Design a binder for this molecule. Structure first.
Ligand SMILES: *[C@@H](C(=O)O)[C@H](O)C(=O)N[C@@H](CC(C)C)C(=O)NCCCCNC(N)=[NH2+]
Ligand SMILES: *[C@@H](C(=O)O)[C@H](O)C(=O)N[C@@H](CC(C)C)C(=O)NCCCCNC(N)=[NH2+]
Lengths: 173, 173
């Protein structure tokens, strides 16, 4: 389907998200594994590093803040930067060519007692389709495969039928 | 090279062993991921489950006993059995067809102040080559690939030049 494809070279899915609140741990482990060309990071280990005192269900379901995500990247030799919007196709193209990972911070369009769950995903790269559309390739931690998102649209449809608005990005993993 | 190949269906290498003493954690995570068709087990998490109080270098380098390996499999819904020898080609063929994993317990032929380090590896399956040789396919946690071992020989040459005698096996993961 693609005429041009630009991906993070060594990105590989090695684990998927089950019943826990560790989406940002999944996302940062896969981006650091790709930019360092390693297999040592795993979500559980990220989470235990940042939340050493939580146990049981609290450990299982407590997610991360953007500050915790930025400090984690600094501890692993990166300098992540918060961008308070969705990255453009050109931005993704240039960061991907430079081997810099991008985490997506998404907010669920569908509500539940007025609250919009937050969910983090990873950018894998970008591509131009045969009809000219400019797309960003995304890995959502629940899936064993990637999605393609038109770059003009800031709401990503995910595999269970929900929709997440890409409201901010952390780049530099 | 093979005329017949019998492997554990969903075995996949998802991580390799760096500077730690967690070979048995690597081996059991890959065998349980394959027999359960999952990606949730990782060596670090096995080790932390069995050694919750060790920290720092003690945590990093303390390996497992066979009893700890057997109790770990019981906690994950398996009934591993210790066999005080190398499994035969036929045994590997039948266990593999039945989706039962086998851990190799190896002892280093080369010594260091009279001590023979212990190192655990995983069986992936078995195969018959085009010249008729009967072989067992092995994954050593340090490698990103498999080895083939003639079934008549109980000493496996590994990738750094050392040799490990297969002295016992734990099957049933
Ligand atoms: C994501 C998930 O597992 O699906 C998980 O809930 C998560 O990390 N959510 C985040 C937001 C993403 C990073 C966009 C969020 O909800 N953050 C607030 C969680 C803060 C938990 N508290 C502390 N104190 N660390
Ligand atoms: C293997 C390695 O990382 O290369 C690692 O050293 C290991 O687990 N070795 C084992 C033997 C294999 C299971 C054959 C071994 O050396 N066992 C004795 C280690 C016991 C450590 N102590 C306790 N108390 N749990």
């Amino acid at each position: 389907n693609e005429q041009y494809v630009n991906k993070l070279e060594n990105f590989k899915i090695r684990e998927t998200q089950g019943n826990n609140g560790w989406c940002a741990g999944y996302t940062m482990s896969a981006l650091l594994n790709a930019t360092y060309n390693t297999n040592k990071y795993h979500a559980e280990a990220v989470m235990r590093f940042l939340h050493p005192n939580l146990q049981g269900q609290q450990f299982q379901f407590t997610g991360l803040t953007p500050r915790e995500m930025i400090y984690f990247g600094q501890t692993q030799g990166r300098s992540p930067q918060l961008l308070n919007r969705m990255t453009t196709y050109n931005e993704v193209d240039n960061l991907t060519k430079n081997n810099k990972g991008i985490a997506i911070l998404g907010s669920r369009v569908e509500s539940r007692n007025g609250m919009h769950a937050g969910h983090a995903m990873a950018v894998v790269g970008n591509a131009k389709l045969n009809n000219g559309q400019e797309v960003i390739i995304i890995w959502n931690p629940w899936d064993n495969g990637f999605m393609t998102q038109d770059a003009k649209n800031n709401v990503i449809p995910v595999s269970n039928g929900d929709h997440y608005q890409w409201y901010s990005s952390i780049y530099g993993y």
